[PDB]
Amino acid sequence: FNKVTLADAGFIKQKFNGLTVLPPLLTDEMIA
Amino acid sequence: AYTNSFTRGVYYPDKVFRSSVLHSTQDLFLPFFSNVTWFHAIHDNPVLPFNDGVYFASTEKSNIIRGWIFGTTLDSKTQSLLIVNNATNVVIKVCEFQFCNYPFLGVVYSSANNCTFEYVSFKNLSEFVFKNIDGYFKIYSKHTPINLVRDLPQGFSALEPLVDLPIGINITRFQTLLALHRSYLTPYYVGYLQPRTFLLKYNENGTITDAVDC
Amino acid sequence: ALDPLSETKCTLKSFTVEKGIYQTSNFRVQPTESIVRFPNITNLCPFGEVFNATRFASVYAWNRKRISNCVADYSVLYNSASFSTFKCYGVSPTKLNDLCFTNVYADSFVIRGDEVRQIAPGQTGTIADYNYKLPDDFTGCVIAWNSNNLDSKGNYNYLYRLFRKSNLKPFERDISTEIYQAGSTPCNGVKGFNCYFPLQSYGFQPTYGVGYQPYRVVVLSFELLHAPATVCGPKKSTNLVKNKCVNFNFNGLTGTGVLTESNKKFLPFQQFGRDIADTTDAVRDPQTLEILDITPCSFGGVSVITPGTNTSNQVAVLYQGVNCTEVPV
Amino acid sequence: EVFNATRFASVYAWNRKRISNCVADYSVLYNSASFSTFKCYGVSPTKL
Amino acid sequence: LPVSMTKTSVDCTMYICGDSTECSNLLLQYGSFCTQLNRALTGIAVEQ
Amino acid sequence: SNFGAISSVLNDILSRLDPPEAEVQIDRLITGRLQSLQTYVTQQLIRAA
Amino acid sequence: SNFGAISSVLNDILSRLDPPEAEVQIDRLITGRLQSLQTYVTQQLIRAA
Numbered sequence A: 001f002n003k004v005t006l007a008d009a010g011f012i013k014q015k016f017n018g019l020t021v022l023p024p025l026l027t028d029e030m031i032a
Numbered sequence B: 001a002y003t004n005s006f007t008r009g010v011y012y013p014d015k016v017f018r019s020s021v022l023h024s025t026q027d028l029f030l031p032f033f034s035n036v037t038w039f040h041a042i043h044d045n046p047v048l049p050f051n052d053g054v055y056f057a058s059t060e061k062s063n064i065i066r067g068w069i070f071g072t073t074l075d076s077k078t079q080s081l082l083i084v085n086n087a088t089n090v091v092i093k094v095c096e097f098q099f100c101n102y103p104f105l106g107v108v109y110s111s112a113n114n115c116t117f118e119y120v121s122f123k124n125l126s127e128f129v130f131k132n133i134d135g136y137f138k139i140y141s142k143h144t145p146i147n148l149v150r151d152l153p154q155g156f157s158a159l160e161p162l163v164d165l166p167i168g169i170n171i172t173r174f175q176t177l178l179a180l181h182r183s184y185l186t187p188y189y190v191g192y193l194q195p196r197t198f199l200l201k202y203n204e205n206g207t208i209t210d211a212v213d214c
Numbered sequence C: 001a002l003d004p005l006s007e008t009k010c011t012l013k014s015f016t017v018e019k020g021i022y023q024t025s026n027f028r029v030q031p032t033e034s035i036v037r038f039p040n041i042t043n044l045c046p047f048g049e050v051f052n053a054t055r056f057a058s059v060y061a062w063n064r065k066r067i068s069n070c071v072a073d074y075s076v077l078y079n080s081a082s083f084s085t086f087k088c089y090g091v092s093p094t095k096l097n098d099l100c101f102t103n104v105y106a107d108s109f110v111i112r113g114d115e116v117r118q119i120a121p122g123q124t125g126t127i128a129d130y131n132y133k134l135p136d137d138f139t140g141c142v143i144a145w146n147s148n149n150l151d152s153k154g155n156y157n158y159l160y161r162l163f164r165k166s167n168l169k170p171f172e173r174d175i176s177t178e179i180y181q182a183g184s185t186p187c188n189g190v191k192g193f194n195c196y197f198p199l200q201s202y203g204f205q206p207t208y209g210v211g212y213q214p215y216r217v218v219v220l221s222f223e224l225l226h227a228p229a230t231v232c233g234p235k236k237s238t239n240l241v242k243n244k245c246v247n248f249n250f251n252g253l254t255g256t257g258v259l260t261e262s263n264k265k266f267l268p269f270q271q272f273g274r275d276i277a278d279t280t281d282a283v284r285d286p287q288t289l290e291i292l293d294i295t296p297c298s299f300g301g302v303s304v305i306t307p308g309t310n311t312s313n314q315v316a317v318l319y320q321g322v323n324c325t326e327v328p329v
Numbered sequence D: 001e002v003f004n005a006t007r008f009a010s011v012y013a014w015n016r017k018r019i020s021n022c023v024a025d026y027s028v029l030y031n032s033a034s035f036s037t038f039k040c041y042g043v044s045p046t047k048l
Numbered sequence E: 001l002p003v004s005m006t007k008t009s010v011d012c013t014m015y016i017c018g019d020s021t022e023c024s025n026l027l028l029q030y031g032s033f034c035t036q037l038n039r040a041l042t043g044i045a046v047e048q
Numbered sequence F, G: 001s002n003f004g005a006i007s008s009v010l011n012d013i014l015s016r017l018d019p020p021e022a023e024v025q026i027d028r029l030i031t032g033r034l035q036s037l038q039t040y041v042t043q044q045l046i047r048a049a
């Protein structure tokens, strides 16, 4: 989890002209 | 009379605020590592050309230098702009002028013909950038402490515009003038800007950190 | 419009709908209280001088004037029927009373009425190519009217350049009276063969018919960049508000969203910031000078969840990413 | 055949010689000192 | 091995027009373009 | 991107012009942005595959 | 292919036309060539996958 980072993304890092990011159905806890 | 133009002489290209983001822009900028002329002020009044923009610089604490002449011919026949660092207030005006051979401020003399308008407003280095953009003569200025004896300080520093003058007069040449202790009428660094594409790194507080020449 | 279930039905273009979740609508709350801001400008610039002064220069040496720090009224201009010619290329005349331009250049000159056609973008001819050239992307309006009552007795003082070694670039002038080398034979002030004077006078005699008669011309150019303004329409400003979705106008630019005091330390020379998407995120008020942030009100995304219509008519609604405190609006 | 002819037509003596499908320059008459009048209206002579 | 990209969706009408009713009316002339695009992106989202 | 339009800010077009020409300018913006969305969506399908 | 333009030789339009009408014609040709490249790079991506 510490290796992959989104610090260089745009909207993914961050209203923004209708763009939207939906959460996955499975969160990281149940995947774990 | 020559030295390396280190990474300096950067200015805010626009009034738009940006922070903690990288941005690209195309505008007139003297490139890095270029040549800059140094003059034999150590012990004749000089004159120099103005190609597109002139990158001035000089170490001053007591304000020995008192402004710059700007113009196309400097022949008392066409409008030319004059800046005077008067002790009360700085003064700017453009008019035809009876330019003497040594028009230095003897202490004060000046001239004026067919005037259009007027406007009023070594420990530390002072530098200015002059852009004769179409219909707009943009002025930029800086004032920061230094430790170098004669060489330009390698530390980066970029800064905001002083003022913009709408005349946009023909500027083909420009001259330098300062004040002398006595009045005796008798018959610093310079660089040239070029059109380049620049990458600007804005950080928190909107402050420009550094840049990279394309 | 009856209910979300009905909305889902007409979205899927079917009466029956099976069990599932269907992205179907967007609830953009976006209330719009009206607010506007501009600087304290009251000085009316000398528009009448450029449009009513008796002394006007000729097209070969067309006059140029800068208009700034002034209130602008365009109703007086387009309502004045005296302007026989009135055209615009980058802005509609009615909208001029609502915008701000940051600077205005007022050009004026006199020409024969038949030559009025050349004053437009992309035009050609001696007037366009050798006396007064407009840029192809000109942003302004061209105004002209008959001037026989003033520029006609003939008034040969009005001169026009006929030729030059090359066509003039936009907003250029060439008052060089040097005789043109109109051929192989060189000349130094000799007005002989293939060596003619660069300018000629107009036969502005009132005996000539309309079109041939002199027409006065006025051209306005707008510096549309919007960082400084100080040049705005006659419309009055009003008190701003905070934390409410309002249609806002500052110095002519406009947008819609929530307003809040900006913590960003803008420099005094700055007026407004831009985000990653280059959209305005904050702005400097043109009356109090403080900086206030700008943010849209909400994504508004809405989806409907429901079992099969065969099974039941009950439905539930999901507001995508919206905080439950704001959904009642 | 016209600028160096030995006989010229009177005002009453109408003449219209046919010129077509040929390529020749006007520069000769444009720089002819004898042609005291080289006034043109339809296009600049340099467009020849 | 990658498993699933971040689910994304876009409001075609508001993105293209930014709540401009005039633009929306003009966009209606293109037909079902926005619906088809939304459908495709939704399919991708479900695929994740 | 302006796509040949006088400006990329739609509100400027709506405010600077009257509808009899703004529809044309808007049509140019519509074409450009729609093409961008089409390219983006197609690329997303391929990456999804 | 001219794509509805007066010609396909780019220099021909710029020679026969002045800048004002040339803009609309060259814009059409630009749109057509862009469309072709888009079709060329979309097929290549599929064939690469």
Ligand SMILES: *[C@@H]1O[C@H](CO)[C@@H](O)[C@H](O)[C@H]1NC(C)=O
Pocket: B001, B002, B034, B035
């Ligand atoms: C700088 O000036 C020196 C002379 O002092 C010259 O030899 C050199 O070519 C100039 N240019 C550069 C890039 O050094």
Ligand SMILES: *[C@@H]1O[C@H](CO)[C@@H](O)[C@H](O)[C@H]1NC(C)=O
Pocket: B072, B073, B170, B171, B172
């Ligand atoms: C400015 O003057 C110079 C001659 O000193 C001339 O070569 C140049 O073309 C002029 N430019 C302008 C702004 O007209």
Ligand SMILES: *[C@@H]1O[C@H](CO)[C@@H](O)[C@H](O)[C@H]1NC(C)=O
Pocket: B204, B205, B207
């Ligand atoms: C911005 O940042 C520093 C610390 O991050 C802060 O002390 C100061 O107010 C600002 N500095 C400049 C150069 O603007």
Ligand SMILES: *[C@@H]1O[C@H](CO)[C@@H](O)[C@H](O)[C@H]1NC(C)=O
Pocket: C039, C040, C286, C287, C288
């Ligand atoms: C305009 O005037 C008001 C008082 O009437 C004052 O509070 C405000 O600061 C002024 N703003 C400007 C930009 O002059």
Ligand SMILES: *[C@@H]1O[C@H](CO)[C@@H](O)[C@H](O)[C@H]1NC(C)=O
Pocket: C309, C310, C311
């Ligand atoms: C729903 O469908 C079932 C069969 O799956 C049927 O038996 C029942 O009558 C239907 N109810 C209706 C018509 O809503």
